[PDB]
């Protein structure tokens, strides 16, 4: 899957305004306050969420994310069509294919309802693989020899798809650290 590597740039036009993106659009973290930026149609308004600029219409695509020091986060892909504005449940039923950590050490897949995961090694790095034609998205524990964390299959897929990130909420005080997309 390593050879299907893709270079992803976070899109500030989708970014929830509490989010702070590094200049190179390779890092995202949650600010202590809220940016003043357009209320445009792509912007996630309710939750600290951001997409990659990239759209996947076909083919196989792979990337990695550092989560070192983080008590919560959310990673995966979603339909370009997913709703941006207002409250919703993160799941395949809303057109997102994600896993997450919340409340330090509780890992779960975004099934409806959510599936708790039994991991042997807390991941410091997460790999995300998309096979469009096979309607598949899978999550590997880079820290544990690239062991499969979880796989969504028979996803079908018709629209364009988007990479998806949240550095999580900081209700904790201790989730300040950013997500980082690893150079590969
Ligand atoms: C709390 N309900 C849940 O089961 C999960 C839990 C969850 C936590 C973390 N990662 C994924 C899932 N929440 C959601 O699906 C969404 C996304 C979530 C975000 C995502 C990453 C940034 C920080 C947290 C916060 N969340 C809501 O708050 C929903 C919300 N409560 C709501 C859903 C419907 C109808 C009215 C409604 O509230 C008005």
From Swiss-Prot:
Entry superkingdom: Eukaryota
Post-translational modifications: Autoubiquitinated; does not lead to its proteasomal degradation. Deubiquitinated by USP4; leading to its stabilization.
Tissue/organ expression: Isoform 1 and isoform 2 are expressed in fetal and adult heart and fetal lung.
Domain called B30.2/SPRY: residue spans: 6-184
Induction note: Up-regulated by isoform 2 of XBP1. Up-regulated by IFNG/interferon-gamma, with a peak after 2-4 hours of treatment in monocytes/macrophages.
Subcellular location: Cytoplasm; Cytoplasmic vesicle, Autophagosome; Nucleus; Cytoplasm, P-body
Function field: E3 ubiquitin-protein ligase whose activity is dependent on E2 enzymes, UBE2D1, UBE2D2, UBE2E1 and UBE2E2. Forms a ubiquitin ligase complex in cooperation with the E2 UBE2D2 that is used not only for the ubiquitination of USP4 and IKBKB but also for its self-ubiquitination. Component of cullin-RING-based SCF (SKP1-CUL1-F-box protein) E3 ubiquitin-protein ligase complexes such as SCF(SKP2)-like complexes. A TRIM21-containing SCF(SKP2)-like complex is shown to mediate ubiquitination of CDKN1B ('Thr-187' phosphorylated-form), thereby promoting its degradation by the proteasome.
Family: Belongs to the TRIM/RBCC family.
Oligomeric form and interacting partners: Homotrimer. Interacts (via C-terminus) with IRF8 (via C-terminus). Component of a SCF(SKP2)-like complex containing CUL1, SKP1, TRIM21 and SKP2. Interacts with CALR, CUL1, FBXW11, HSPA5, IKBKB, IRF3, SKP1 and VCP. Interacts with SKP2; the interaction with SKP2 does not depend on an intact F-box domain. Interacts (via N-terminus and C-terminus) with DCP2 (via N-terminus and C-terminus). Interacts with ULK1, BECN1 and with ATG8 family members, including GABARAP, GABARAPL1, GABARAPL2 and MAP1LC3C/LC3C. Interacts with TRIM21 and SQSTM1/sequestosome 1. Interacts with IRF3. (Microbial infection) Interacts (via B30.2/SPRY domain) with severe fever with thrombocytopenia syndrome virus (SFTSV) NSs; this interaction activates NFE2L2-mediated transcriptional activation of antioxidant genes.
Domain comment, as recorded: The coiled-coil is necessary for the cytoplasmic localization. The RING-type zinc finger is necessary for ubiquitination and for the IRF3-driven interferon beta promoter activity. Interacts with SKP2 and CUL1 in a RING finger-independent manner. The RING-type zinc finger is necessary for ubiquitination of NMI.
The protein, known as: E3 ubiquitin-protein ligase TRIM21
Organism field: Homo sapiens (Human)
Residues of the full protein shown: 287 to 465 of 475
């Amino acid at each position: 899957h390593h050879h299907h590597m893709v270079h992803i740039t976070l899109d500030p036009d989708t970014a929830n305004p509490w989010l702070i993106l590094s200049e190179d659009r390779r890092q995202v973290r949650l600010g202590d306050t809220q940016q003043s930026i357009p209320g445009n149609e792509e912007r996630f308004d309710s939750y600290p969420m951001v997409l990659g600029a990239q759209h996947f219409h076909s083919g196989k695509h792979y990337w990695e994310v550092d989560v070192t020091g983080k008590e919560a986060w959310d990673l995966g892909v979603c339909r370009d069509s997913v709703r941006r504005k207002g409250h919703f449940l993160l799941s395949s039923k809303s057109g997102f294919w994600t896993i997450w950590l919340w409340n330090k050490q509780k890992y779960e897949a975004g099934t409806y309802p959510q599936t708790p995961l039994h991991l042997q090694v807390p991941p410091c790095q997460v790999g995300i693989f998309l096979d469009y034609e096979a309607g598949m998205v899978s999550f590997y524990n880079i820290t544990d020899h690239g062991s499969l964390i979880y796989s969504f299959s028979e996803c079908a897929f018709t629209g364009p798809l988007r990479p998806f990130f949240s550095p999580g909420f900081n209700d904790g005080g201790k989730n300040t650290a950013p997500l980082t997309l690893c150079p590969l």
